[PDB]
Design a protein around this ligand. Structure first.
Ligand SMILES: N[C@H]1CCC2(CC1)[C@H]1C[C@@H]3C[C@@H](C[C@H]2C3)C1
Ligand SMILES: [Cl-]
Lengths: 24, 23, 24, 23
């Protein structure tokens, strides 16, 4: 696997979750 | 990879929800 | 990789650009 | 892939700047 792509994917999922919960 | 795919869809979805949240 | 990953990449670059500009 | 690497770097930077901007 690609460490950078894994980290960016996880960070991206976390980003949407935190943004949603912030907008609620 | 299901992670890469899921994060790809989630990334596209994130921009959509952001634009609509801003407009 | 595939057109999904490409599209999400382009869309992620676009997202940061538009967020920075919307934030200025 | 260059585009994927750049988007990975940009995605990480995006979250960091968003969190900070929000605080
Ligand atoms: N919000 C971003 C959009 C771009 C990606 C990170 C999250 C996403 C997951 C991986 C694979 C591509 C490029 C980045 C890494 C699509
Ligand atoms: Cl915002």
């Amino acid at each position: 696997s690609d460490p950078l792509v894994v980290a960016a994917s996880i960070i991206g999922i976390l980003h949407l979750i935190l943004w949603i919960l912030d907008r609620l």
